[PDB]
Amino acid sequence: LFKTETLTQNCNEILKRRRHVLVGISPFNSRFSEDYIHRLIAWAVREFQSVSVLLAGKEAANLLEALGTPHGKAERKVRKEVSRNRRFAEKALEAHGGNPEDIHTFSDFANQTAYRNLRMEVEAAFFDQTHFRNACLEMSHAAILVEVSADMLELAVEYVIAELPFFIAAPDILGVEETLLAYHRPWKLGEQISRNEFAVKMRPNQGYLMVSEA
Numbered sequence: 001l002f003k004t005e006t007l008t009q010n011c012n013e014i015l016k017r018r019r020h021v022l023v024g025i026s027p028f029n030s031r032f033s034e035d036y037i038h039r040l041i042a043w044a045v046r047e048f049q050s051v052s053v054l055l056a057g058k059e060a061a062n063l064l065e066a067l068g069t070p071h072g073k074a075e076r077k078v079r080k081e082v083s084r085n086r087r088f089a090e091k092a093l094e095a096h097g098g099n100p101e102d103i104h105t106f107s108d109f110a111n112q113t114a115y116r117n118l119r120m121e122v123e124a125a126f127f128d129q130t131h132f133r134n135a136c137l138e139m140s141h142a143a144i145l146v147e148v149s150a151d152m153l154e155l156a157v158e159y160v161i162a163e164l165p166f167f168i169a170a171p172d173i174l175g176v177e178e179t180l181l182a183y184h185r186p187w188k189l190g191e192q193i194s195r196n197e198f199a200v201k202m203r204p205n206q207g208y209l210m211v212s213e214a
């Protein structure tokens with residue numbers, strides 16, 4: 001039903017224990033359709049003890065703004081899109097035996113200590129290390145995905161910075177022992193992170209699970 005590919009041999013060991021998976025769902029991404037979300041979550045609930053859903057926070061508007069959508073309309077548009085992702089995930093979670101309250105957005109933790117610490121770690125790296133800054137900008141290019149300017153990227157990159165703590169430690173934010181972030185795309189930044197190319201480090205209880213249909 002789904003084929004999986006881990007980041008590291010560590011990501012693989014977390015995978016073997018099947019404790020928690022954090023399923024990402026992106027706004028405005030043709031991948032996530034009601035039927036697809038239903039299948040993914042179905043598979044998650046089967047394969048793991050515990051399933052959580054991660055949605056896009058407020059900075060998702062930065063993406064629409066980079067595409068020239070005006071600021072006010074951008075927030076309203078993101079609100080509609082994300083609340084719609086939520087409704088689809090709630091349905092699926094309810095239907096397959098998961099907990100409908102296990103949906104979060106990456107903005108929900110803004111005042112949480114664990115989230116703020118991590119966001120600081122990422123900002124310090126973003127500003128200090130040029131390599132990291134560029135990896136991040138490449139990634140925000142990926143997110144916006146008719147020409148793309150450097151200012152568009154300085155805008156959209158807020159999205160990548162806000163999201164990243166769930167990629168490097170979700171467990172600290174959600175209070176869970178260990179977890180895998182499941183998503184359909186390859187994560188290039190993650191591959192570099194895993195090789196110790198930056199001051200940002202993936203926590204030993206976190207892993208990235210690339211998931212694809214079968």
